[PDB]
Amino acid sequence: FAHFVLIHGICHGAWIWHKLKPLLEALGHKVTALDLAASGVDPRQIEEIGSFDEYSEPLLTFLEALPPGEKVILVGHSLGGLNIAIAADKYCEKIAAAVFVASVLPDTEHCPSYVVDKLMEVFPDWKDTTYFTYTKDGKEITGLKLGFTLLRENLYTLCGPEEYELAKMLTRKSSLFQNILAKRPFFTKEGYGSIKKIYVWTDQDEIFLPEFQLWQIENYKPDKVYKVEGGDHMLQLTKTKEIAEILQEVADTYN
């Protein structure tokens, strides 16, 4: 059996995994679904957070708490692929594999903002998404709150109204920390570069467009690619059984 650690994307929280966690547990696995900083029911506000690395603190702290010899399979969604890379550069030995589900896939050859800048060229219009600025640690940071119409049409395209309602209800303001990411030291070959990486995507994704998702595969070759037919960007909501099937096959492959 495996221990999966489920990692949401920006403006989201552990709650996006509410369908997938019971299914993985019904297969016998251990599952942790974290709220990152200022996300979900985390007490902090985004304006206290000055970088992706501080944003990732609950994942780093969880991994620090793993006793020696315990390995986990990280599963990230959307921007959560970046939290994976940060965690991997400190605790690569605790990571049996990383699975990127409709997610960004950073590399080691370019700066940590690389795949995010590519994402805004491929998808530059975020519809009713609002933006704001705050200063933390001397740097001006642009925060955002995903627009409800963007959520409806581009992320939750195929989700029922009861799932979409949770998003209107629970998504919170966040930030891409895009300028901070550009100046951060590169992810390292020895840490992040060394972990097994499995890339899960759908060409029906209406925000992480096929051009982007395919460019990422070409830019940084995963150890395994699964293409999910159908669904939408919220693959753990619209294709939950398929994702649990893929995760069982990763566990069977990577301990």
Side-chain angles (χ1 to χ4, degrees), residues 16-17 20 77 100-103 155 159 200-205 213 226-240 242-244 246:
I16 70 179
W17 307 106
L20 179 61
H77 181 244
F100 304 78
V101 178
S103 148
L155 284 76
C159 303
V200 185
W201 76 292
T202 167
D203 60 30
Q204 306 300 299
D205 194 319
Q213 280 294 267
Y226 295 89
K227 182 204 262 248
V228 178
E229 300 318 311
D232 65 14
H233 180 72
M234 298 292 332
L235 278 182
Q236 61 293 75
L237 298 175
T238 49
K239 293 290 170 167
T240 316
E242 283 77 17
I243 297 299
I246 292 165

Side-chain angles (χ1 to χ4, degrees), residues 1-26 28-29 31-70 72-89 91-108 110-120 122-138 141-157 159-161 163-182 184-188 191-240 242-255:
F1 291 124
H3 182 173
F4 295 95
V5 183
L6 314 179
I7 305 160
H8 63 79
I10 56 136
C11 301
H12 284 73
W15 54 264
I16 70 179
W17 307 106
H18 79 99
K19 295 177 77 175
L20 179 61
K21 186 164 175 290
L23 280 184
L24 294 173
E25 296 178 339
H29 304 288
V31 186
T32 300
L34 300 177
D35 279 333
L36 307 168
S39 316
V41 296
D42 190 88
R44 300 165 273 196
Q45 294 330 102
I46 200 60
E47 293 92 353
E48 307 161 48
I49 316 289
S51 75
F52 253 88
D53 292 71
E54 318 173 29
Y55 171 52
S56 313
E57 169 276 313
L59 171 59
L60 295 167
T61 297
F62 174 88
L63 288 179
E64 205 179 48
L66 291 177
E70 291 202 9
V72 295
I73 300 183
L74 305 188
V75 185
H77 181 244
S78 201
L79 261 305
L82 269 164
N83 307 100
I84 284 183
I86 293 156
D89 262 4
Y91 301 105
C92 69
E93 74 288 343
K94 313 225 203 175
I95 298 166
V99 182
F100 304 78
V101 178
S103 148
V104 301
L105 179 69
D107 68 9
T108 48
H110 306 91
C111 86
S113 66
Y114 202 18
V115 303
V116 182
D117 325 302
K118 192 54 157 131
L119 170 65
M120 322 277 182
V122 174
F123 191 93
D125 179 4
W126 292 52
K127 293 191 169 156
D128 49 345
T129 282
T130 60
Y131 300 85
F132 61 97
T133 58
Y134 65 95
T135 64
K136 181 84 215 293
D137 284 18
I141 301 174
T142 298
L144 76 170
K145 191 165 183 311
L146 303 181
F148 284 173
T149 297
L150 185 77
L151 293 177
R152 179 73 272 181
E153 286 171 0
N154 298 85
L155 284 76
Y156 295 76
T157 316
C159 303
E163 291 302 328
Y164 174 61
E165 194 65 31
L166 283 165
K168 301 215 273 162
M169 256 204 182
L170 300 170
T171 58
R172 301 169 49 184
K173 61 185 184 295
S174 196
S175 172
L176 298 167
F177 300 105
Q178 171 162 31
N179 43 347
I180 322 299
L181 274 184
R184 176 192 197 283
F186 289 26
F187 298 118
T188 78
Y192 173 59
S194 87
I195 64 170
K196 296 294 200 303
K197 307 188 187 55
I198 295 108
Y199 187 86
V200 185
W201 76 292
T202 167
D203 60 30
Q204 306 300 299
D205 194 319
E206 311 268 38
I207 176 155
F208 282 25
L209 276 36
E211 172 179 1
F212 177 67
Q213 280 294 267
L214 288 160
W215 171 95
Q216 282 200 136
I217 289 171
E218 165 80 346
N219 172 68
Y220 190 63
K221 160 167 202 235
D223 299 286
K224 181 63 175 171
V225 179
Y226 295 89
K227 182 204 262 248
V228 178
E229 300 318 311
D232 65 14
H233 180 72
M234 298 292 332
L235 278 182
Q236 61 293 75
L237 298 175
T238 49
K239 293 290 170 167
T240 316
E242 283 77 17
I243 297 299
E245 279 164 25
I246 292 165
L247 301 193
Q248 180 64 61
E249 175 178 9
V250 177
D252 281 4
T253 295
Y254 299 99
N255 289 28

